[PDB]
Design an enzyme around this catalytic site. Structure first.
Site, PDB file in Angstrom:
ATOM      1  N   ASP A 108       1.945  -3.798   7.052  1.00 24.04           N
ATOM      2  CA  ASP A 108       2.409  -3.357   5.740  1.00 24.04           C
ATOM      3  C   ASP A 108       1.989  -1.938   5.352  1.00 24.04           C
ATOM      4  O   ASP A 108       1.150  -1.741   4.476  1.00 24.04           O
ATOM      5  CB  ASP A 108       1.991  -4.371   4.656  1.00 24.04           C
ATOM      6  CG  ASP A 108       2.776  -4.196   3.352  1.00 24.04           C
ATOM      7  OD1 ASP A 108       3.749  -3.405   3.319  1.00 24.04           O
ATOM      8  OD2 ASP A 108       2.424  -4.852   2.343  1.00 24.04           O
ATOM      9  N   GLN A 158       0.762  -7.138  -9.664  1.00 20.49           N
ATOM     10  CA  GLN A 158       2.116  -6.576  -9.601  1.00 20.49           C
ATOM     11  C   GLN A 158       2.184  -5.134 -10.090  1.00 20.49           C
ATOM     12  O   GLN A 158       1.916  -4.849 -11.251  1.00 20.49           O
ATOM     13  CB  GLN A 158       3.092  -7.434 -10.414  1.00 20.49           C
ATOM     14  CG  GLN A 158       4.557  -7.038 -10.253  1.00 20.49           C
ATOM     15  CD  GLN A 158       5.469  -7.770 -11.224  1.00 20.49           C
ATOM     16  OE1 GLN A 158       5.608  -8.993 -11.166  1.00 20.49           O
ATOM     17  NE2 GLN A 158       6.087  -7.021 -12.131  1.00 20.49           N
ATOM     18  N   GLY A 159       2.546  -4.221  -9.194  1.00 19.51           N
ATOM     19  CA  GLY A 159       2.619  -2.822  -9.590  1.00 19.51           C
ATOM     20  C   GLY A 159       1.553  -1.982  -8.915  1.00 19.51           C
ATOM     21  O   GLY A 159       1.648  -0.757  -8.919  1.00 19.51           O
ATOM     22  N   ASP A 160       0.542  -2.641  -8.339  1.00 22.04           N
ATOM     23  CA  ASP A 160      -0.546  -1.951  -7.639  1.00 22.04           C
ATOM     24  C   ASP A 160      -0.269  -1.803  -6.151  1.00 22.04           C
ATOM     25  O   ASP A 160      -0.960  -1.049  -5.469  1.00 22.04           O
ATOM     26  CB  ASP A 160      -1.866  -2.712  -7.794  1.00 22.04           C
ATOM     27  CG  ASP A 160      -2.426  -2.652  -9.205  1.00 22.04           C
ATOM     28  OD1 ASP A 160      -2.268  -1.598  -9.873  1.00 22.04           O
ATOM     29  OD2 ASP A 160      -3.039  -3.664  -9.635  1.00 22.04           O
ATOM     30  N   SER A 161       0.703  -2.539  -5.631  1.00 22.54           N
ATOM     31  CA  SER A 161       1.000  -2.444  -4.196  1.00 22.54           C
ATOM     32  C   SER A 161       1.158  -1.015  -3.695  1.00 22.54           C
ATOM     33  O   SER A 161       1.738  -0.150  -4.380  1.00 22.54           O
ATOM     34  CB  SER A 161       2.269  -3.225  -3.843  1.00 22.54           C
ATOM     35  OG  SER A 161       2.054  -4.622  -3.948  1.00 22.54           O
ATOM     36  N   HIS A 191       6.260  -2.695   2.093  1.00 23.18           N
ATOM     37  CA  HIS A 191       7.109  -3.467   1.182  1.00 23.18           C
ATOM     38  C   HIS A 191       7.527  -2.732  -0.088  1.00 23.18           C
ATOM     39  O   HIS A 191       8.294  -3.260  -0.889  1.00 23.18           O
ATOM     40  CB  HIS A 191       6.480  -4.841   0.845  1.00 23.18           C
ATOM     41  CG  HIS A 191       5.409  -4.806  -0.207  1.00 23.18           C
ATOM     42  ND1 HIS A 191       4.063  -4.725   0.092  1.00 23.18           N
ATOM     43  CD2 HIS A 191       5.491  -4.890  -1.559  1.00 23.18           C
ATOM     44  CE1 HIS A 191       3.365  -4.764  -1.031  1.00 23.18           C
ATOM     45  NE2 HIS A 191       4.207  -4.863  -2.046  1.00 23.18           N
TER      46      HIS A 191
END
Ligand SMILES: [Ca+2]
Length: 223
Positions: free
Chosen positions: A82, A169-172, A37
């Site tokens: 993913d 948010q931002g660690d994906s 993603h």
């Protein structure tokens, strides 16, 4: 990372920051393993920048390398699978992170790291943050997410009862890892999704690397 602490310079040298606001791991010096993603799809792509070698993104010692191509898990559509690989134009000369090929390490306490928010709605971080999150069973995780959780393709982690420590948010795309039987870090997950961050009853969900290891390795040989 919510509820974490600063990682020491050199502690997790396989970590890389990606330009779209994701983390990644050096699967090979010139191949980043990240989340599907985090990319739009497969193909030649020189628009992504990977920043390696440093915990402080502002450091003059940072090594910024552009991508050359992206390989997103075939068939990805937001329901599992993913994972993605990003080929770099030049190698980042840092240790790599071995991926788990069995499920023997899909348990115990994991470690996560990233430059993502340290609170819901927060800004991205200048310094790499790390945290320890315990494995959460499929059942306990399913009690929270129901059918959204993809059996055998996702593994969860965090504190189901009280929250407080989680990726955000931002660690994906970042790796979720732990020590193997030879005292070496081994990657068991990829930061994927969750409802909010560090909320009681809603653990973080990660791509189950053991399930995709053979696919990832084969795909990497083609880059
Ligand atoms: Ca699972």
């Amino acid at each position: 990372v919510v509820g974490g602490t600063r990682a020491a310079q050199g502690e997790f040298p396989f970590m890389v920051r990606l330009s779209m606001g994701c983390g990644g791991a050096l699967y090979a010096q010139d191949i980043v393993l990240t989340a599907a993603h985090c990319v739009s799809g497969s193909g030649n792509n020189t628009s992504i920048t990977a920043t390696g070698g440093v915990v402080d993104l502002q450091s003059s010692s940072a090594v910024k390398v552009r991508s050359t191509k992206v390989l997103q898990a075939p068939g990805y559509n937001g329901t599992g699978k993913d994972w993605a690989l990003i080929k770099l134009a030049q190698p980042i000369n840092q240790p790599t992170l071995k991926i788990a090929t069995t499920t023997a390490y899909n348990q115990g306490t994991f470690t996560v790291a990233g430059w993502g928010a340290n609170r819901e709605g927060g800004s991205q971080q200048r310094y790499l943050l790390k945290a320890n999150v315990p494995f959460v069973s499929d059942a306990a995780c399913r009690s929270a997410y129901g059918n959204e959780l993809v059996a055998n393709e996702e593994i969860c982690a965090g504190y189901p009862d009280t929250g407080g420590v989680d990726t955000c948010q931002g660690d994906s795309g970042g790796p979720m890892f732990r020590k193997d039987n030879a005292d070496e870090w081994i990657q068991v997950g990829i930061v994927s999704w969750g409802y909010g961050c560090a909320r009681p009853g809603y653990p973080g969900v990660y791509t189950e690397v053991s399930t995709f290891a053979s696919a990832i390795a084969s795909a990497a040989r083609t880059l």
